[PDB]
Amino acid sequence: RPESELIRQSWRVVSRSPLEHGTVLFARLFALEPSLLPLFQYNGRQFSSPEDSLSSPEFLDHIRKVMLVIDAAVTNVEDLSSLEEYLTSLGRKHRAVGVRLSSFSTVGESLLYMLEKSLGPDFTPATRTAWSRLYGAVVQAMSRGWDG
Ligand code: HEM
Ligand SMILES: [Kr]
Ligand SMILES: [Kr]
Numbered sequence: 001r002p003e004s005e006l007i008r009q010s011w012r013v014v015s016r017s018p019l020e021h022g023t024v025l026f027a028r029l030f031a032l033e034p035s036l037l038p039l040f041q042y043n044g045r046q047f048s049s050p051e052d053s054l055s056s057p058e059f060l061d062h063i064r065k066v067m068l069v070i071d072a073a074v075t076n077v078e079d080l081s082s083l084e085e086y087l088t089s090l091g092r093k094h095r096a097v098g099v100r101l102s103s104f105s106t107v108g109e110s111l112l113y114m115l116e117k118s119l120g121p122d123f124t125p126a127t128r129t130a131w132s133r134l135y136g137a138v139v140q141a142m143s144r145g146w147d148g
């Protein structure tokens with residue numbers, strides 16, 4: 001595909017500082033959907049404000065976990081069927097923590113935001129379209145974890 005190379009090339013810049021970049025992604029996510037904040041319950045406590053999440057080692061570790069799953073989809077961009085079972089179970093896990101499948105749409109917008117902001121003029125509409133398709137295929141696999 002041309003799209004596989006566009007994904008690989010765009011990811012390279014972002015993937016070298018995944019926490020910095022994932023921090024943009026989550027900052028955007030909470031600005032768009034503040035109701036996601038309480039779902040991160042570590043030692044049974046709720047973050048009051050988005051800035052609270054950024055001082056939590058566990059929350060920051062979760063950002064790294066996200067960027068690593070994205071990294072695995074990039075590695076497997078030419079066939080995501082090989083991550084499908086892992087992703088379905090990732091979905092079931094998120095269902096169990098309280099995340100609504102519809103919130104993954106906001107996550108997708110946040111990812112695209114973070115890419116746009118990091119790549120600037122290099123985030124061509126083909127690059128946008130490629131990532132939208134890759135993320136959509138990830139979410140399709142994850143959705144199996146909600147049943148349907
Ligand atoms: C609305 C979005 C999300 C929320 C509220 C959320 C919340 C959580 C929570 C509470 C956990 C369990 C505690 C933890 O390990 O830190 C978790 C685990 C995890 N999440 Fe997320 N998450 C979201 C999106 C994502 C996305 C998009 C990915 C990957 C692309 C991701 C990857 C993971 C991984 C890899 C784990 C470890 C799961 C395991 O135990 O095997 N999460 N998430
Ligand atoms: Kr954040
Ligand atoms: Kr994501």
Ligand SMILES: [Kr]
Nearest residue numbers: 108131132135
């Ligand atoms: Kr996306």
Ligand SMILES: [Kr]
Nearest residue numbers: 070073134135
């Ligand atoms: Kr992705």
